[PDB]
Design a protein around this ligand. Sequence first.
Ligand code: NIO
Ligand code: NIO
Ligand code: 2AF
Ligand code: 2AF
Lengths: 347, 347
Amino acid sequence: TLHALLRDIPAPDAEAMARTQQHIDGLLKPPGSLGRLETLAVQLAGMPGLNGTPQVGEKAVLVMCADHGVWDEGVAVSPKIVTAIQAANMTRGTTGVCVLAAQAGAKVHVIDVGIDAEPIPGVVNMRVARGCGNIAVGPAMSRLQAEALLLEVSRYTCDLAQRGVTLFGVGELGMANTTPAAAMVSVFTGSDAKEVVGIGANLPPSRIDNKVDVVRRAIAINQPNPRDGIDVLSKVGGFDLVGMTGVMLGAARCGLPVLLDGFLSYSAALAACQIAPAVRPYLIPSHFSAEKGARIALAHLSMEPYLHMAMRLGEGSGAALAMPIVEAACAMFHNMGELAASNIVLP
Amino acid sequence: TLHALLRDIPAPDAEAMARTQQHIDGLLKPPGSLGRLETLAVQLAGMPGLNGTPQVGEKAVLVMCADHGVWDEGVAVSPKIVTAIQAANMTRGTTGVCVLAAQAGAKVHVIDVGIDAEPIPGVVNMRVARGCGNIAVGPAMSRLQAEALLLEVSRYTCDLAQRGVTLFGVGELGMANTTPAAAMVSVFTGSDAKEVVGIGANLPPSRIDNKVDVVRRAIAINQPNPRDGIDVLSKVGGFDLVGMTGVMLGAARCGLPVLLDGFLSYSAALAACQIAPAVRPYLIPSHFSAEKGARIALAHLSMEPYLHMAMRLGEGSGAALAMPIVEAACAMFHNMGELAASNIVLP
Ligand SMILES: O=C(O)c1cccnc1
Ligand SMILES: O=C(O)c1cccnc1
Ligand SMILES: Nc1ccccc1O
Ligand SMILES: Nc1ccccc1O
């Protein structure tokens, strides 16, 4: 079922992209002057789920929530229960993603893939377990659990496409999750833990060393295979991370765009592209995370974010903030006048 | 009258800013996690025209249009008449700024400060002359003309504030205007012309040398005084550039924020800050222009743009694109829930 899914990811439509580029070149402006907005418009035009043109219909931010066993290693200063509390707030519209998504006209879908607490009413239930295993002493989960969640989340994502959603945004919520994120980045990029381990949610500078040590132990003990994204996710990842990877595989299979968020999302995207390179064309960066390993992770994905906001909240907040930018590419494409109609000729 | 104006620019309200910072720190998120969005919110709170809080009411983009005598030196490949044509399109909603401003819910005000063509119906008439003097052989205009336009535009800007406008965006339109922009940047920053002269609207690489030469001649012949922003503007600037400087002085006097656009706007802001350092606190960067001298100009203004879009259209298009970001800071500030209300305590 997963092989089928990965097999059916459509390649971008080069024909629609060429038509788009020609149309953009003819707009009321010096050719190429709107830079990355032009490039983004063309990219969108190549996505089969969008009907050959840069269009944006309904918008959704999927937030994957889960707890992590590695929290017990003292790698995070936020109380573990904050995952459960914030997930509930996500249903009240008071969180950072909620407020930014509301501003963008997007709906937030809160999905519980493994919070260590009783079920929260109003949150989508796809709970694998009450938190994943502590990666410092063994794997986060079984390969089977990782594959099942990928399928599950993937289907949910592409099913939203049937409800008019054309643009996705991915996000997470899970105390201590910048630890497995860093382990994955280290593994996929071949970078040393010290180079990609950050302060997460205000970790005191004095406790960084321990965090770096925990990441190295996780890798040494699990021996994840860099060439197998599912192996890496199941061993040194987490449920929230697997879920984000699933949103990306689902949107790609649906031929639709997905906006990345910050550091946690970069880790998930490295996994997704490792598992299926065909996913890459559908990914759109949003902002440049203030987390230490962001530069390395983005360099390996060959992505240059549009927004430099020193943000490090997570939740899909950056994804929501960039949605207007995607709408701008559409507006540009469909609403600008044409040079020829004004009798203007430029070399 | 100009001395009065400059004298009456209010300092930022430190009391409102402290109250803002405390409120932001108490929001549902790790302290400081929304980074530059938090900083922007505080900055807005200190602006007297906004009522002690980051608020955005009506939005306006002021586009200053004028022609330049230096066009005759072969520094621009766009036909001179494009200024007049595009200014007319600005009244039809088909231009790049129009489309992006519409997306942001802002109104575009097109102001003719010196187009070399017959008056265009629908465009605000503040025409100094039919194009400014060719800076390669003498000054763009008299000091008197520069001061009069500054006053004129300044009053117009702050008068809009009485109509509910709380956020301004500045833009321009004028063939060959990246030449005087570069001369001004060179003068204010002490950088050599070759380091700040760019391709403007697709100038062929083979004609760059001539453009660099024209900039040096302009400076040698006029001998503008770097410590006198009005001297520089009148000698090696242009009507559109003076006008943009005027919007900045007017918004500051009104105690309101102004969003910069690209390279031309950076030149105008260097002049504005030279003339009145008190203007600085009211300036908000938008994007990082793809023009060659952008880095140097931004470094001298100590500004780090939020958007990296490789844009180089001008017209205030970048300013419009960043307006949602300013609205996001307000949304964050007013709509997020508080940590205490959720019983969350973080170190
Ligand atoms: O980049 C992120 O999304 C991030 C960084 C630190 C802590 N939480 C989220
Ligand atoms: O940065 C700008 O605004 C710009 C650069 C080149 C040509 N026109 C405008
Ligand atoms: N629209 C346009 C066209 C040519 C040169 C500059 C411009 O802003
Ligand atoms: N709201 C929040 C609080 C603590 C840690 C991470 C979060 O996203």
